[PDB]
Amino acid sequence: ATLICGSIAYDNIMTFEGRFREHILPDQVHLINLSFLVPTMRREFGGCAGNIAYALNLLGGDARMMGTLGAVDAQPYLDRMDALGLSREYVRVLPDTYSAQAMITTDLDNNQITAFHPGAMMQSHVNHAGEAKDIKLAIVGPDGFQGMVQHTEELAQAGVPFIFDPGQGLPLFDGATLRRSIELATYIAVNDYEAKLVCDKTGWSEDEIASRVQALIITRGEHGATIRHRDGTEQIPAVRAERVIDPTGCGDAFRGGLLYGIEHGFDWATAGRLASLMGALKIAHQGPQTYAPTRAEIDARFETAFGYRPK
Amino acid sequence: ATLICGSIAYDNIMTFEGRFREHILPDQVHLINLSFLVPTMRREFGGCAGNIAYALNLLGGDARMMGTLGAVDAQPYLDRMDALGLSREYVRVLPDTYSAQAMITTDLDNNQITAFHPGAMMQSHVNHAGEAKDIKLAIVGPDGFQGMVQHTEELAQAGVPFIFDPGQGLPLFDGATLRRSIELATYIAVNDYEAKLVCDKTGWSEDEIASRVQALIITRGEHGATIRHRDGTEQIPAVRAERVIDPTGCGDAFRGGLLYGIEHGFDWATAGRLASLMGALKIAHQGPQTYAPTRAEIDARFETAFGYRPKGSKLRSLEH
Ligand SMILES: Nc1ncnc2c1ncn2[C@@H]1O[C@H](COP(=O)(O)OP(=O)(O)O)[C@@H](O)[C@H]1O
Ligand SMILES: Nc1ncnc2c1ncn2[C@@H]1O[C@H](COP(=O)(O)OP(=O)(O)O)[C@@H](O)[C@H]1O
Ligand SMILES: NC(=O)c1ncn([C@@H]2O[C@H](CO)[C@@H](O)[C@H]2O)c1O
Ligand SMILES: NC(=O)c1ncn([C@@H]2O[C@H](CO)[C@@H](O)[C@H]2O)c1O
Ligand code: NA
Ligand code: NA
Numbered sequence: 001a002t003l004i005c006g007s008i009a010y011d012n013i014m015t016f017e018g019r020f021r022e023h024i025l026p027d028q029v030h031l032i033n034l035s036f037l038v039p040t041m042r043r044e045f046g047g048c049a050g051n052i053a054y055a056l057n058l059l060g061g062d063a064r065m066m067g068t069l070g071a072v073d074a075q076p077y078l079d080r081m082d083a084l085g086l087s088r089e090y091v092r093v094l095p096d097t098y099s100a101q102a103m104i105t106t107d108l109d110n111n112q113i114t115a116f117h118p119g120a121m122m123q124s125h126v127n128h129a130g131e132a133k134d135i136k137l138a139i140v141g142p143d144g145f146q147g148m149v150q151h152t153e154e155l156a157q158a159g160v161p162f163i164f165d166p167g168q169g170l171p172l173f174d175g176a177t178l179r180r181s182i183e184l185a186t187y188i189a190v191n192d193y194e195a196k197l198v199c200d201k202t203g204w205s206e207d208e209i210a211s212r213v214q215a216l217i218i219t220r221g222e223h224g225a226t227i228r229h230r231d232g233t234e235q236i237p238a239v240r241a242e243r244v245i246d247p248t249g250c251g252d253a254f255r256g257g258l259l260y261g262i263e264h265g266f267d268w269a270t271a272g273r274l275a276s277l278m279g280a281l282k283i284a285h286q287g288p289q290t291y292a293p294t295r296a297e298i299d300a301r302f303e304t305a306f307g308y309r310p311k
Numbered sequence: 312a313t314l315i316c317g318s319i320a321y322d323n324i325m326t327f328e329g330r331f332r333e334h335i336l337p338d339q340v341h342l343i344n345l346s347f348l349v350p351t352m353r354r355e356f357g358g359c360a361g362n363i364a365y366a367l368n369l370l371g372g373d374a375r376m377m378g379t380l381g382a383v384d385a386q387p388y389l390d391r392m393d394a395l396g397l398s399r400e401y402v403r404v405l406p407d408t409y410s411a412q413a414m415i416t417t418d419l420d421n422n423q424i425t426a427f428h429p430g431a432m433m434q435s436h437v438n439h440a441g442e443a444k445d446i447k448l449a450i451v452g453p454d455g456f457q458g459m460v461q462h463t464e465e466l467a468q469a470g471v472p473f474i475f476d477p478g479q480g481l482p483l484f485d486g487a488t489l490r491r492s493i494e495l496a497t498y499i500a501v502n503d504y505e506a507k508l509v510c511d512k513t514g515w516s517e518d519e520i521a522s523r524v525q526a527l528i529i530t531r532g533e534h535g536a537t538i539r540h541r542d543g544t545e546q547i548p549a550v551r552a553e554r555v556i557d558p559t560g561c562g563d564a565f566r567g568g569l570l571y572g573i574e575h576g577f578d579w580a581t582a583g584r585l586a587s588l589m590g591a592l593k594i595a596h597q598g599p600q601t602y603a604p605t606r607a608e609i610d611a612r613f614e615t616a617f618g619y620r621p622k623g624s625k626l627r628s629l630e631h
Contacts, residue, residue, distance in 0.1 A: 021337075029421075033422065037429060041428065113416055117348075171347075
């Protein structure tokens with residue numbers, strides 16, 4: 001199975017149908033004022049572990065989410081996991097606690113400015129990755145700080161290959177803790193903005209990071225992604241989206257495709273392309289888990305986009 | 312009585328403790344990513360009409376809010392208006408509807424990115440400003456677009472002097488409706504970002520806008536403001552804030568002080584300084600309306616900041 005460690009959250013996403021870049025005026029005192037009209041609030045199922053597991057499950061992989069929810073309002077998510085066939089083995093529900101909630105203000109370029117209400121996520125460390133069983137691959141995504149570090153240490157001690165995915169949790173790390181996490185990790189995945197923040201906080205160049213992992217995966221929105229190794233790089237093209245509606249969750253859809261490819265022994269070019277396709281499927285729908293292709297549809301779309309079938 | 316036309320809303324304010332300028336990376340495909348901790352969601356009383364009226368009410372003015380609320384969740388705001396002595400005369404409540412809700416992300420530089428769910432605000436044009444009685448002064452601020460345009464037409468035709476504050480409503484305007492609104496307006500009040508957008512959309516220079524109103528007022532955050540009128544330009548200083556907690560609503564607090572000064576025949580220098588003071592008292596507290604200086608405290612702080620007592624002139628004051 002693949003262990004997916006990270007936040008499990010309800011999202012309130014406000015997507016500007018536009019680009020904040022077109023609205024910044026650095027020569028004025030105020031850089032940006034923008035008010036945009038949105039529809040009625042829809043609470044979405046989200047969280048990085050929710051999102052990555054949803055994607056891996058769409059592909060037919062065996063996704064085991066490890067994260068904490070709050071008993072006050074966990075039930076709709078637990079019912080959804082059961083409906084989707086997502087194991088709740090490592091989903092811990094904490095009495096008298098609220099689930100994490102994200103208020104995400106964003107645009108069509110995935111410039112997410114998020115106000116996060118952590119709730120139960122603050123106690124995510126009560127789950128220990130070292131207590132999970134029969135795990136062949138893992139990811140450690142944004143979560144409570146203690147939990148992220150503890151998951152990294154326990155997976156490394158067991159020798160389980162894992163992607164370190166610090167994402168929104170990057171502020172929680174200092175240089176020394178970030179360096180150690182990258183030394184421990186088998187792979188690191190970040191978007192291009194976060195990759196710059198990781199280089200600044202560690203002091204390492206991208207080449208130096210690539211000397212300390214099997215792969216440094218940097219996603220670049222509409223421009224695709226790069227997969228960097230100590231001895232070469234794969235450029236992964238984007239798939240043209242059917243429509244660009246909401247990029248929130250694109251990286252997590254991408255990580256679920258990547259995880260499936262690594263588990264199934266795809267080469268990096270092919271694992272990266274599957275990941276890219278999942279990101280393009282996601283962006284065509286509002287909310288991180290609204291896209292719902294069947295496995296047959298994903299296979300067809302991969303052939304259409306890339307001119308071959310994986311293996 | 313001063314008619315305050317604009318949104319009436321509940322605000323959810325998410326304060327980034329920093330400056331967006333320090334986190335923009337234009338060379339990346341993602342310009343900015345932030346994720347910051349916030350406490351439990353708490354709705355604050357907001358909307359431009361609520362904020363401006365609250366400021367005018369703190370000064371002892373007679374503020375008449377004109378706007379729409381939704382019955383499902385209007386009651387806390389109605390009860391608050393009653394507690395404060397704000398007339399509900401022109402506050403219309405729509406059945407089976409939610410009130411406007413703003414989800415506002417701020418930084419410390421007073422940058423705002425707001426997702427706005429209009430709710431009852433979509434029907435703001437059901438109130439007609441030209442029908443309000445014995446109004447001596449008005450402001451038209453951000454609101455449902457049809458309401459904003461309608462209020463401007465009606466106030467101009469009734470001959471009521473009014474400030475035009477397109478504010479966050481600017482995206483809804485085109486050049487033609489924006490130029491028309493400015494032609495009709497007695498004064499325009501904007502922050503500098505908005506002032507740039509007005510010049511861009513109208514095709515007018517600040518000079519050209521200034522020629523079509525009695526005063527063009529441009530606020531510049533902690534740098535203060537300018538008031539351009541017939542005879543000159545007032546450079547209005549900021550008042551040093553006791554602390555900076557939340558800039559949301561600083562321009563509205565400023566507009567309340569400006570409206571009080573215009574009503575009472577303050578000179579522009581003095582009306583501007585009162586407005587500037589209200590902006591500073593507001594930023595020291597979370598929410599657009601939680602600052603609650605007594606009227607004596609306002610006068611004492613004006614004296615400390617500026618060295619004189621803020622007074623007006625009956626001859627220059629407004630009558631209905
Ligand atoms: N506009 C887009 N068109 C097509 N695919 C996209 C687009 N935006 C993102 N994707 C796919 O999703 C991946 C992850 O998106 P990105 O925005 O980099 O991630 P994150 O969500 O972590 O910021 C991209 O590498 C790309 O494959
Ligand atoms: N940091 C500050 N310190 C002191 N006064 C401030 C500060 N920020 C704003 N103000 C006062 O509030 C007024 C309006 O703020 P501004 O940010 O221009 O408006 P808006 O809220 O409309 O964007 C300023 O002209 C100033 O008088
Ligand atoms: N941990 C954090 O600070 C954080 N901020 C946003 N998120 C989640 O990030 C996902 C988007 O990639 C959303 O579903 C959110 O719930 C987070 O986990
Ligand atoms: N009309 C709009 O698009 C809009 N956007 C924000 N606001 C209000 O603007 C006030 C701050 O000036 C807040 O209290 C918000 O309710 C608005 O009225
Ligand atoms: Na490593
Ligand atoms: Na005019």
